[PDB]
Amino acid sequence: CLAEGTRIFDPVTGTTHRIEDVVGGRKPIHVVAAAKDGTLHARPVVSWFDQGTRDVIGLRIAGGAILWATPDHKVLTEYGWRAAGELRKGDRVAVRDVETGELRYSVIREVLPTRRARTFGLEVEELHTLVAEGVVVHN
């Protein structure tokens, strides 16, 4: 699950939404979703889930972005999809370049301690993945 405040880019409108507003308003936004072969596609959000309060860890990535997710949340990495809680400083996560919209990988600069926060989830059609805080993750 992704923490309150997690920003999600909609490739269709070009608008960036906070996940808690997308869920609270059941907004049918589109997201940048990643397939298997490492390609990016636009996919619509069809379901919204308020996951309640849970422990979310922070992954600070080269460039400043910090992804806050539950330690069990799957993130696309240089070694495939791994739980966020298994990642360590030095591992590279898949990120969407804000300029080219292309996929690349960035180094995790620091792993932050857990903190309590409302968490959310979504159902992304077909591909069930999305770019949150610029990072490719499971929905």
Q: How far is CA 137 from the centre of its chain?
A: 4
CA 61 → CA 72, 74, 78, distances in Å?
Answer: 18, 16, 14
Q: How far apart are CA 94 and CA 84, in angstroms?
A: 12
Per CATH, the number for 1-139 is 2.170.16.10
Technique used: X-ray
Question: Which are the contacts of 1, defined by CB distance < 8 A and separation ≥ 6?
Answer: 49, 51, 54, 56, 69, 70, 73, 119, 120, 121
Measure the CA–CA gap between 123 and 117, rounded to whole angstroms: 20
Q: What does the angle CA 50 – CA 6 – CA 10 come to, to the nearest 5 degrees?
A: 95
Element (H, E) at 23: helix 19-24
Domain boundaries, given as residue ranges, for the chain: 1-139
The secondary structure of residue 102, as a DSSP letter, is -
Q: Which residues pair with 129 in a beta bridge?
A: 138
Distance CA 55, CA 23 (A): 19
**Of the candidates 66, 47, 65, 15, the residue with the CA atom closest to the CA atom of residue 128:** 47
Q: Any bridge partners for residue 118, and if so which?
A: 53
Residues 6+ apart with CB under 8 A from 80: none
Reported resolution, Å? 1.7
Q: Which two tokens stand for residue 4?
A: 């309150």
Judge contact between 91 and 108, C-beta under 8 A: yes
